Write an enzyme that holds these catalytic residues in place. Structure first.
Site, PDB file in Angstrom:
ATOM      1  N   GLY A 145       1.992   6.404   9.585  1.00 36.61           N
ATOM      2  CA  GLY A 145       3.372   6.378   9.302  1.00 36.61           C
ATOM      3  C   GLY A 145       4.066   5.051   9.690  1.00 36.61           C
ATOM      4  O   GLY A 145       5.349   4.739   9.329  1.00 36.61           O
ATOM      5  N   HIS A 184       0.837  -1.306  -0.222  1.00 34.91           N
ATOM      6  CA  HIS A 184       0.040   0.079   0.051  1.00 34.91           C
ATOM      7  C   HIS A 184       0.774   1.217  -0.140  1.00 34.91           C
ATOM      8  O   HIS A 184       0.416   2.565  -0.131  1.00 34.91           O
ATOM      9  CB  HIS A 184      -1.207  -0.007   1.148  1.00 34.91           C
ATOM     10  CG  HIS A 184      -0.586   0.039   2.457  1.00 34.91           C
ATOM     11  ND1 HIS A 184      -0.746  -0.973   3.404  1.00 34.91           N
ATOM     12  CD2 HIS A 184       0.146   0.872   3.111  1.00 34.91           C
ATOM     13  CE1 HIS A 184      -0.330  -0.495   4.479  1.00 34.91           C
ATOM     14  NE2 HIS A 184       0.277   0.675   4.461  1.00 34.91           N
ATOM     15  N   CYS A 226       3.524   1.818   9.594  1.00 35.00           N
ATOM     16  CA  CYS A 226       3.395   0.721   8.375  1.00 35.00           C
ATOM     17  C   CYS A 226       4.755   0.281   8.108  1.00 35.00           C
ATOM     18  O   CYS A 226       5.518   1.037   7.733  1.00 35.00           O
ATOM     19  CB  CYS A 226       2.381   0.837   7.182  1.00 35.00           C
ATOM     20  SG  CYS A 226       0.726   1.097   7.978  1.00 35.00           S
TER      21      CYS A 226
HETATM   22  N1  LIG Z   1      -0.744   5.745   6.001  1.00 36.87           N
HETATM   23  C1  LIG Z   1      -1.129   4.619   5.392  1.00 36.87           C
HETATM   24  C2  LIG Z   1      -2.012   3.790   6.420  1.00 36.87           C
HETATM   25  C3  LIG Z   1      -1.799   3.745   7.828  1.00 36.87           C
HETATM   26  O1  LIG Z   1      -0.739   4.266   8.047  1.00 36.87           O
HETATM   27  N2  LIG Z   1      -2.823   3.163   8.529  1.00 36.87           N
HETATM   28  C4  LIG Z   1      -2.423   3.145  10.054  1.00 36.87           C
HETATM   29  C5  LIG Z   1      -1.800   1.887  10.726  1.00 36.87           C
HETATM   30  N3  LIG Z   1      -1.473   1.798  11.912  1.00 36.87           N
HETATM   31  C6  LIG Z   1      -2.092   2.698  12.963  1.00 36.87           C
HETATM   32  C7  LIG Z   1      -2.669   3.873  12.287  1.00 36.87           C
HETATM   33  C8  LIG Z   1      -3.059   4.918  13.039  1.00 36.87           C
HETATM   34  C9  LIG Z   1      -3.540   6.079  12.823  1.00 36.87           C
HETATM   35  C10 LIG Z   1      -3.704   6.351  11.104  1.00 36.87           C
HETATM   36  C11 LIG Z   1      -3.548   5.369  10.521  1.00 36.87           C
HETATM   37  C12 LIG Z   1      -2.797   4.093  10.852  1.00 36.87           C
HETATM   38  C13 LIG Z   1      -2.213   2.603   5.824  1.00 36.87           C
HETATM   39  C14 LIG Z   1      -3.035   2.120   4.451  1.00 36.87           C
HETATM   40  O2  LIG Z   1      -4.657   2.294   4.667  1.00 36.87           O
HETATM   41  C15 LIG Z   1      -4.415   3.718   5.452  1.00 36.87           C
HETATM   42  C16 LIG Z   1      -5.868   4.061   5.340  1.00 36.87           C
HETATM   43  C17 LIG Z   1      -6.139   5.405   6.004  1.00 36.87           C
HETATM   44  C18 LIG Z   1      -5.363   6.106   6.842  1.00 36.87           C
HETATM   45 CL1  LIG Z   1      -5.566   7.605   7.550  1.00 36.87          CL
HETATM   46  C19 LIG Z   1      -3.891   5.354   6.825  1.00 36.87           C
HETATM   47  C20 LIG Z   1      -3.539   4.266   6.299  1.00 36.87           C
END
Ligand SMILES: NC[C@]1(C(=O)Nc2cncc3ccccc23)CCOc2ccc(Cl)cc21
Ligand SMILES: NC[C@]1(C(=O)Nc2cncc3ccccc23)CCOc2ccc(Cl)cc21
EC number: 3.4.19.12
Lengths: 304, 304
Positions: B143, B41, B145
């Protein structure tokens, strides 16, 4: 989302751990620049621990009696001195992995990471706090002495603890990196009992703010209180008194959630008086006090 | 003495973390040998996450569209491929800090350490478990991931998890290092609800053995039970069924304490039925299930 008891990445500290042996006693040392720091009780036999005269025991030790091993290679000891309850073994080689570092003496309530070691080798990392009675609740077995506690500010490691002793109650005592024990503890196998292990109120409040940030909001009540009224309750529950300095430190968490510090105090007061009723907060059935307000902001903001 | 939620020393994994950027999306990657592994992703915009066709989105990407930075130096991408839900970015430089490693797919109940990272930089380390519903309860922000989960056997890192997603309930989903998600989760921003988060019975029993080894013995009862009778109670409390394989795995803890596994099951049965009554076990007011029997033996024996 989620909130975990998180330790600092331990790599910078793993690069400093060495094994120190004196006679038949082995423990861990911390190698920074050309100095290895270790508990002075490395010179003691089990019998000596009962009533050690460290200055006298040290007369019988020369540089060659301290064996310092880094990995599987021996370091050459060219000097040794006792500073309070630690020995400083000067070696002929500066640690090439020496990180930027400071020696700090922390206050009760402050948290830090511990890298538990045996024979100079890291076994695990966990987070803990300096209790208000100056003990720490660690996880240490025989041979763990010389393991250190630390905090990291980006690339600088502030070393704050070195493990020396376990009290008969299973709690731990140690020194800062200048060899001064935290609290009244001594490096002697004698009757040493810890005082009241009170709860670190400002840390519980910070963790209640972390719970609100992560969606656990059931405990938010319709009340407020004052510091004086709250502290009357805190005293009753063996919680540390909350000061205006603690209120100032909680300011950023209050702003992030929109919950005034005294309102959170009133919610904490009701949790103390009513109990949890079988409910949990951030996966805990008790009020967690080993996250400082700075730890909560760091974990909830992602400081690297 | 003492028993802590302990993570593996993170140094070997810190040496593998890199930042991966594709267009305006940034996350973490794991650099082992000449390959950087990261969630696929990284190629998606926020809009793409709603219904991504990864094969189609990947057609619009060349080697030069993936920016890999290790510290403050850029790595040259000479190949890229998608394996399940991860991308493998072949780089022209083998990671000089590559530890001995394996890729393993863990079972529910198994624990591991997570090195949470942002922009390729480590922020913290914590311990967690693969839940029976295949989620993990981590601490991850946007961030994070590409942050990985791992276990260490002396000098070999077995990588078992890579973070990909957070469900609307604040729990986490990810893959093994071959890109296969744990459980039924997908890398799409859609309605995905987790199943029952049952308690890992064999891990609670291991932690009750750790409590006995560390002096917390109040909960030891005068009863015994059978697997069938115990499991009738475990089912009622949303605990995983205990098998004879779990009994065999608890053997060494049973031998160390002299408490038969079924006697400990009977003590657990009474704790479930009677509650804790305001008491604690190893500083917890609930039954901890994120220590495996192997973790208990390791922590109580001092494996480095
Ligand atoms: N920036 C990419 C991604 C991510 O980091 N996800 C998250 C993963 N773990 C904890 C998170 C805590 C708050 C926010 C997002 C979180 C993964 C792909 O799908 C998405 C979809 C929406 C958002 Cl807002 C982020 C994402
Ligand atoms: N081996 C030296 C030393 C030590 O390591 N202490 C311990 C420190 N922390 C956790 C312990 C868990 C079990 C056992 C000992 C523990 C310190 C000096 O005084 C003593 C005195 C007696 C003994 Cl048996 C050990 C020691």
């Amino acid at each position: 989302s989620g909130f975990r008891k998180m330790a600092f990445p331990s790599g910078k500290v793993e690069g400093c751990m060495v094994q120190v042996t004196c006679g038949t006693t082995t423990l861990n040392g911390l190698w920074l620049d050309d100095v290895v720091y270790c508990p002075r009780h490395v010179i003691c036999t089990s019998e000596d621990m009962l009533n050690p005269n460290y200055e006298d025991l040290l007369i019988r030790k020369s540089n060659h009696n301290f064996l310092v091993q880094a990995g599987n290679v021996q370091l050459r000891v060219i000097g040794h001195s006792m500073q309070n309850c630690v020995l400083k073994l000067k070696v002929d080689t500066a640690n090439p992995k020496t990180p930027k570092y400071k020696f700090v003496r922390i206050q009760p309530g402050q948290t830090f990471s511990v890298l538990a070691c045996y024979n100079g080798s890291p076994s695990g990392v966990y987070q803990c706090a300096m209790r208000p009675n100056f003990t720490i609740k660690g996880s240490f077995l025989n041979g763990s002495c010389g393991s250190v506690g630390f905090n990291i500010d980006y690339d600088c490691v502030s070393f704050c603890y070195m493990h020396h002793m376990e009290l008969p109650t299973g709690v731990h005592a140690g020194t800062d990196l200048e060899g001064n024990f935290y609290g009244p503890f001594v490096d002697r196998q004698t009757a040493q009992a810890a005082g009241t292990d009170t709860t670190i109120t400002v840390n519980v409040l910070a963790w209640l703010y972390a719970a609100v940030i992560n969606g656990d909001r059931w405990f938010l009540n319709r009340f407020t209180t004052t510091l004086n009224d709250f502290n009357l309750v805190a005293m009753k529950y063996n919680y540390e008194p909350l000061t205006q300095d603690h209120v100032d430190i909680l300011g950023p968490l209050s702003a992030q959630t929109g919950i005034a510090v005294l309102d959170m105090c009133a919610s904490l007061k009701e949790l103390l008086q009513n109990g949890m009723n079988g409910r949990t907060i951030l996966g805990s059935a008790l009020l967690e006090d080993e996250f400082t307000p700075f730890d909560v902001v760091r974990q909830c903001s992602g400081v690297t």
